A paper describes a structure:
Based on the work on Tch. tepidum LH1-RC, we have examined the LH1 complex from a spectrally unique mesophilic purple sulfur bacterium, Thiorhodovibrio (Trv.) strain 970; this phototroph shows an LH1-Qy at 960 nm, the most red-shifted Qy of all BChl a-possessing species. As for the thermophilic Tch. tepidum, calcium ions were responsible for this ultra-redshift; removal of Ca2+ resulted in a blue-shift of the LH1-Qy to 875 nm, whereas the subsequent addition of Ca2+ restored 960-nm absorbance. In addition to the large redshift of the LH1-Qy, the special pair BChl a dimer in the RC of Trv. strain 970 also exhibits a red-shifted absorption band at 920 nm6, the longest wavelength reported for all BChl a-containing RCs (which typically range from 865 nm to 890 nm).
The cryo-EM structure of Trv. strain 970 LH1-RC was determined at 2.82 Å resolution, and its overall structure draws both parallels and contrasts with that of the Tch. tepidum LH1-RC13. The LH1 subunits of strain 970 are uniformly distributed around the RC forming a closed, slightly elliptical double cylinder composed of 16 pairs of helical α(inner)β(outer)-polypeptides (αβ-dimer), 32 BChls a, 16 carotenoids (3,4,3′,4′-tetrahydrospirilloxanthin), and 16 Ca ions. Cofactors in the RC include four BChls a, two bacteriopheophytins (BPhe) a, one 15-cis-carotenoid, a menaquinone (MQ)-8 at the QA site, and a ubiquinone (UQ)-8 at the QB site. Of the 16 Ca ions present in the Trv. strain 970 LH1 C-terminal region between the inner and outer rings, each is coordinated by the main chain oxygen atoms of α-Trp47 and α-Ile52, the sidechain carboxyl group of α-Asp50, and the main chain oxygen atom of β-Trp45 in the adjacent subunit. The additional hydrogen bond between His48 and BChl a, together with an interacting triangle formed with BChl a–Trp47–His48–BChl a, further strengthens interactions between the pigment and surrounding polypeptides and stabilizes the conformation of the BChl a molecules. Six copies of the α1- and eight copies of the α3-polypeptides form two groups and align on the two sides of the LH1 ellipse.
Residue numbers in the entry:
A (entry chain Q): 4 to 81
B (entry chain L): 2 to 273
C (entry chain M): 2 to 319
D (entry chain H): 2 to 258
E (entry chain R): 3 to 46
F (entry chain P): 5 to 46
G (entry chain T), H (entry chain V): 4 to 46
I (entry chain S): 1 to 72
The structure:
Amino acid sequence: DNFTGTYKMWMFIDPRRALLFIASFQILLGILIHMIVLGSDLNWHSDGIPKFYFPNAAEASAPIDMSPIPSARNFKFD
Amino acid sequence: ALLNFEKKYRVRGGTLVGGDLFDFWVGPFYVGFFGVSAVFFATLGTMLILFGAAIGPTLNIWQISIAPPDLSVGLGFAPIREGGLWQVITICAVGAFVSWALRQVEIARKLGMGLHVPFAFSFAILAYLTLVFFRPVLLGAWGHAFPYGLFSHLDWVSNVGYQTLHFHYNPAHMLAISFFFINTLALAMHGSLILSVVNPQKGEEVKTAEHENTVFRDIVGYSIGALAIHRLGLFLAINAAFWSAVCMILTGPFWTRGWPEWWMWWPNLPIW
Amino acid sequence: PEYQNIFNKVQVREPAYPGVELPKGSLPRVGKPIFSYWLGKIGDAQIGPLYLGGWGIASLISGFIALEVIGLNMLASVGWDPRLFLKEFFWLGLEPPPPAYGLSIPPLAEGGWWLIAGLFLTMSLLLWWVRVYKRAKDLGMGTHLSWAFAVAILFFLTLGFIRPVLMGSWGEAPPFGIFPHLDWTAAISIRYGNFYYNPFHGLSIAFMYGSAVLFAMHGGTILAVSRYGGDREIDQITDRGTAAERAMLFWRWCMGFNASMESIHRWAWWFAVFCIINSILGIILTGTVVDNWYLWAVKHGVAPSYPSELTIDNPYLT
Amino acid sequence: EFGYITQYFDLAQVTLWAFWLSLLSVIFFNRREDKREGYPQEAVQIFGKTILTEGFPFMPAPKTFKLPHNGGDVVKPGPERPQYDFKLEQVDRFAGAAYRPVGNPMLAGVGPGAYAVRANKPDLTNAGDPRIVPMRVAKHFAVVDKDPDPRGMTVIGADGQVGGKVTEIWVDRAEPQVRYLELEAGNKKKVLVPIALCVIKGQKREVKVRSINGIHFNDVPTLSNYDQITLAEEDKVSAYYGAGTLYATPNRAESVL
Amino acid sequence: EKSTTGLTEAESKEFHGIFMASMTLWFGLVVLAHILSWLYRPWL
Amino acid sequence: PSTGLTESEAKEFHGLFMASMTLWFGLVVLAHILSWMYRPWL
Amino acid sequence: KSTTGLTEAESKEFHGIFMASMTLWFGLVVLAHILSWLYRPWL
Amino acid sequence: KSTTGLTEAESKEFHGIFMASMTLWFGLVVLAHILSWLYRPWL
Amino acid sequence: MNAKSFDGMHKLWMIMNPVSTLWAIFIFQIFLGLLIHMVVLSSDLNWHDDQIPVGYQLQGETLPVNLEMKAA
Amino acid sequence: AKSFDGMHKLWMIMNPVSTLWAIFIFQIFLGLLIHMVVLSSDLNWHDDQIPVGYQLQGETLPVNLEMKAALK
Amino acid sequence: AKSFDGMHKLWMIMNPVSTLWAIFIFQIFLGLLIHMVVLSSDLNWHDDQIPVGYQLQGETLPVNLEMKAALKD
Amino acid sequence: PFTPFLLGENEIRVSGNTDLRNTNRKSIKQAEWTFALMTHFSEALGVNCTYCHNSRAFMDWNQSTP
Ligand code: BCL
Ligand code: BCL
Ligand code: BCL
Ligand code: BCL
Ligand code: BCL
Ligand SMILES: CC(C)=CCC/C(C)=C\CC/C(C)=C/CC/C(C)=C\CC/C(C)=C/CC/C(C)=C/CC/C(C)=C/CC/C(C)=C/CC1=C(C)C(=O)c2ccccc2C1=O
Ligand SMILES: COC(C)(C)CCC/C(C)=C/C=C/C(C)=C/C=C/C(C)=C/C=C\C=C(C)\C=C\C=C(C)\C=C\C=C(/C)CCCC(C)(C)OC
Ligand SMILES: [Ca+2]
Ligand SMILES: [Ca+2]
Ligand SMILES: [Ca+2]
Ligand SMILES: [Ca+2]
Ligand SMILES: [Fe+3]
Ligand SMILES: [Mg+2]
């Protein structure tokens, strides 16, 4: 084959540093993808399935920037 | 009282004015010609501030205020009750500050050292003179300076700032704030490092200069050195003061629009 | 005149210094040290090497993810044009969610990217904290630099996470820009009635002025006795020479009291930390306890009272 | 109603009091740390008696520095080494009067020419070697070209006369930089001058030392061994150059205006 | 001269064996998570 | 032995580490079963 | 002279494996793009 | 005098491969631009 | 040449450090991956919010349980 | 025509490794820059809704339309 | 005609490598700058909608028009 | 700022009438919108804030000008 001697990689790249990089990167990427998916239409915490559990506002508009601070908690904006 | 080691350094000479007449100590202080001057002017200024509080509406410490003349007086002489007291006190203040600096020069000459501290004090003095003398002269009236009062010079600062709609966009103001912030950061790091090296982990020896270099090269990759951090310190503080003086001499004399509109020179360069 | 000791007139080189030996079980230091002639005119000329272990790599991954996010949103706000990016650079920013969303997680282009960047920047600074602590402790030194860093991190988290949560809105936090964050500063003063009548703001200003004063004084005094070997503070501490003696006589004669070569560094530490402690205390009470700082100052007998002469009619009362 | 008041006592008020008390208390501790050097102080009484006083607040309890390489323990506040033998005459008959040196002011060790009494050991590196050494003992150093090498230049001495010639450079191994210049004087002795009292002109190939005069370079203190310097010797050398700032010319201590 | 980590060739072979096994197991678990997510909430 | 542990010490540590991690994950699963019974989220 | 300490044999070895790895990576990239074009064509 | 330690033979070798590589790169650039002109002409 | 033009190419690693190159390539590829994904998500080609194959927030708002609760 | 004979001697005064690294880094930076400059113009190819608009395609799927009708 | 004879001696006082690097870097910076200066004027050639406007071409495709119609209902 | 204020009819006031926390729920963003409109008032007349306010209390009518 062409990949016969790949294991010699660890003779000039430090395996300790490699491990420390990979663990950190994977955990950070996990957190990142979860927050990205939660900030979209695929969100699964406040989507109302299988039921809305909170006492949400009865008529919540589409929020604009020129807004006041809300009086009560609400999680159903759509 | 004298320190354990103080007596062999209390010799005569080193003075600027006066001579052997004012060359003595009173307690721990050294007096000199300029010591007499400074205490004279400080006492007089304080007593006049107090009297100007007595003829006002209240002796509450937070609400005393002595104000400068009106703008119609110009660069003339105002009545005592409507501005002249402010002028006498602002003469006393200059006298006291300069006396302070020259006394420092006498002391340093006697102890055999360099004149770095009075030189750095000179820039505080320069900022004060910018606010009370140079800017008022260029604008044409003493009544452009600030009143003497806690809480009452803050009203001055506020309204002067809003005379340009948004004073945060003043360029020399941005540069001075940069220097102030970096100075506090540097002072925290310097304090921490020396304390850490002479107060090591329990049951260890005092560390060395190599440790001081190593720690910052490990954290950040560069260490400036034990003598250059003192230099960097003198530099950051002096520059803060300098650019404050510039930012105030620009506002009013050389720029009368809003400060955001100055910056408009940048996106109007014909190169984007 | 006489040499002022501001620049190095003659430079000397020896081979680079790798650093004090670390405890066994440590990673090697990365980089080959280089020398800078211009940096050597004012200070030490060596650059590198650097220590990258576990905590300082996780930090630097977090921080760069945050920077990529912030930069890309600033760039999307001009339509991806780099020419316009350079043209209008001080006016661009990444903006927090609209205040009506409360503490929920908003959609990505209406405040979710701000939330992501804030989270990643937070994690970056806490990992850096652990790095600073361990680096000082592995060499056997006191951990005084970690205490001050902790104070600074706490101020970053107060304005930004703790106060927005106590208020009930992420839209109460600063954006990531230059002119945008200056606008935030002015607006929060305008809304809560004049920060000049906030007493913790006055005290922190007292300590910022004091930091500049104290460090001008110390930098001057040590450059002025460096002819007697004063720049070497560790030896002047553990074996007091004439430089320290002259340094302490100067201040004693001038203003009546003095510190020692070790104590002045404790004064420095505290003057830099009280500034930020008062910063935290002043921001944490604004909005949550006090709604108008000027009316507070009037209730507690602090504000002056200019003479009136006129009468203005409030048109909402007519 | 614009300024209606509901209750006088609030949290901002209490917190401000707490801060006033937390300051006011670090002042206390710092002022106590300030008095580990130079105390107890000496108060002179009504008719000359001297007592030891301690100030407000009082002195702290002693702490110990453990110096490296078996360099001993240092207790502070602790004992003091004895002063040497300065002679002084008071000028006016009161406790706050100034003093005059009795003999030759340059060789008296009073005024800006006073020095401390340190250890008779050199300062060490992290490895145990002496820290300040001549460039022939430290064989790895080199002056960076682009910079005037002072070896060879002359040492003009503030009145225009020649003091001697530079023959060596003394470096600092812990932080690589120049600390002293060694020169041969008019009577063929080897004396040091600190680099922070020298103005080096590369083209004139001169070193100007504004502190002392040309003939004064013959009486600079000398070292025991020329492969190292101790803390005591550093102090003596530097102090001799500092005495000239006030004693070199008889007109230097005499009121500018 | 050349940059090395001090591992011989046998140690490198050992490390490589276990590294590849671990990476394969991790990717297996990832695939399983995505099959479940597609069954629950398909995104394309 | 870049950590100074021999192979026996490493074996010992590994045994107890794996046991502890398994117990921790068991407790996590139990918490999630209770939460699903109380407030199902999917 | 700037040098890496590798001889010519070591360089040949490294080059072999480097080129193989890069080719495999580019193959995977091409496959990803064919799938994306089938699902959501962008040009 | 500023020098790189390469002899004249080593410089000739380096130059040969450098020029070959640069020519190949520019060829690929030209191909990319022909495709772009066919798809979305800009002048 | 045209066929023997790239012969000595394997000598490249006698002047270019293999370790630095490897680390640089890996880091650059990760950064570029993040960047391109973020640039494509901010366009019309966005695939998380396009409501294909169905909109899930809308699906949750019109469940019979939620509708019956909102009716009161 | 023999004016460029000694050109190969360039590498006896200019370092080959430094030059290689500089070229590579500059090329990557220029690639990113030109792609961003052309994407921010009328030639933009990600957002132009050609060959079709995908957000608009998702808003008019029959399932989404029927759900939006029953809400309103 | 004989004023510029000794000109080749320039390289005995000016370093050739430093000069080469300076020239190359300056030329690249100037290239970028002039392109950016011309793009920010009336001569801009990316946004001038010649030979056709492509955003406008995308907004009026029949498929996009028919989808935008079925949303007005 | 003209759409909400000079064609729509929104509240320009943002500050409170007492010193401690009360029923006021305006935010810093609303404060920014007000600041924008006031900047236009200043530019359109050739004046500063102090032509109609004392900055130490932008909300008090007894400390304004006529
Ligand atoms: C709405 C108002 C504007 C504003 C309007 C102004 C105005 C107006 C001014 C500043 C000035 C300053 N502003 Mg601003 N500024 C604003 C917001 C900021 C913010 C911020 C975080 O938002 C910061 C960080 C700053 C920071 C600063 C500094 C750059 C500068 C003050 C330092 C100085 O003047 O030193 C200089 C030091 C002195 C003047 C001290 C003089 C010292 C004397 C010689 C010694 C006195 C000794 C004493 C009598 C002895 C007592 C003895 C006892 C025994 C103890 N401003 C807002 C936007 N700002 C000031 C300035 O730049 O002036 C030059 C100034 O005039
Ligand atoms: C709608 C979207 C789905 C969803 C879709 C996915 C998809 C798709 C994936 C995940 C994955 C994960 N999800 Mg999920 N996930 C959802 C909701 C959640 C919620 C929650 C509060 O709602 C939580 C807390 C999680 C948490 C998790 C983690 C267990 C896992 C991420 C591992 C990681 O970060 O790398 C950490 C990695 C390392 C440190 C390096 C390698 C690990 C090595 C071997 C050592 C670590 C120890 C151990 C193995 C750690 C993982 C524990 C398990 C045994 C896997 N998901 C919703 C319902 N989730 C990922 C996963 O399953 O990985 C297998 C994944 O692919
Ligand atoms: C609707 C959501 C549910 C909820 C759903 C969940 C779910 C699902 C989980 C938790 C878990 C936890 N929840 Mg809960 N939780 C709720 C509300 C709360 C409230 C509160 C104020 O409302 C609190 C204080 C808690 C607190 C806790 C902790 C006990 C625990 C996280 C421990 C941890 O971080 O270990 C981190 C620290 C370590 C790993 C250190 C290492 C081990 C140390 C040395 C031993 C610590 C012991 C540990 C705390 C357990 C002790 C219990 C004994 C075995 C009896 N929950 C609500 C009601 N919660 C997690 C859990 O229980 O883990 C088993 C978990 O999976
Ligand atoms: C509309 C656009 C399409 C899309 C179009 C594309 C296109 C086109 C490409 C990707 C590519 C990638 N996409 Mg995608 N992608 C989409 C949505 C996603 C989502 C998501 C949450 O929505 C995620 C998490 C991903 C994630 C990924 C990564 C797997 C991959 C980038 C790899 C990399 O950066 O290597 C950098 C790291 C290195 C070079 C180091 C060596 C690699 C290591 C050892 C292994 C990494 C993973 C490996 C390639 C896959 C596992 C091994 C194989 C199974 C054998 N895509 C949507 C649906 N995506 C790229 C790709 O896969 O190339 C292979 C690619 O060309
Ligand atoms: C309307 C505009 C067109 C477009 C018009 C062009 C034009 C014109 C060109 C490109 C070129 C490129 N385009 Mg394009 N391109 C478009 C959209 C894209 C999109 C996208 C996300 O939409 C991506 C990711 C790309 C990416 C790319 C890169 C492959 C290439 C830039 C190479 C480089 O910078 O190397 C610089 C870095 C180095 C030289 C470092 C040296 C590394 C060595 C030599 C190996 C590098 C491999 C190299 C990247 C690619 C070789 C490909 C192989 C033969 C498979 N284009 C749109 C549709 N594109 C350029 C190109 O093709 O180069 C030939 C080019 O001239
Ligand atoms: C006014 C009156 C009623 C007078 C009557 C009395 C009579 C008749 C005469 C007395 C004689 C004279 C001439 C007195 C003048 C003095 C008077 C009256 C007033 C001045 C007092 C004064 C200005 C004090 C201000 C003190 C303040 C607030 C200082 C600010 C900074 C500060 C807090 C510093 C603390 C830290 C200290 C001590 C720093 C100094 C210090 C520094 C900076 C080092 O670098 C250093 C390096 C190495 C060793 C020691 C030191 C060191 O001690
Ligand atoms: C084009 O550029 C590229 C992409 C190539 C990269 C270049 C990068 C560049 C040029 C970047 C420029 C950046 C600039 C100018 C940044 C300016 C920054 C400033 C001045 C910022 C000032 C203040 C911001 C602050 C104080 C933010 C504080 C935020 C905090 C504390 C966030 C807290 C959020 C948290 C902890 C998360 C909670 C989320 C969750 C999930 C728990 O919610 C429920
Ligand atoms: Ca759900
Ligand atoms: Ca989709
Ligand atoms: Ca398209
Ligand atoms: Ca065109
Ligand atoms: Fe210091
Ligand atoms: Mg804003």
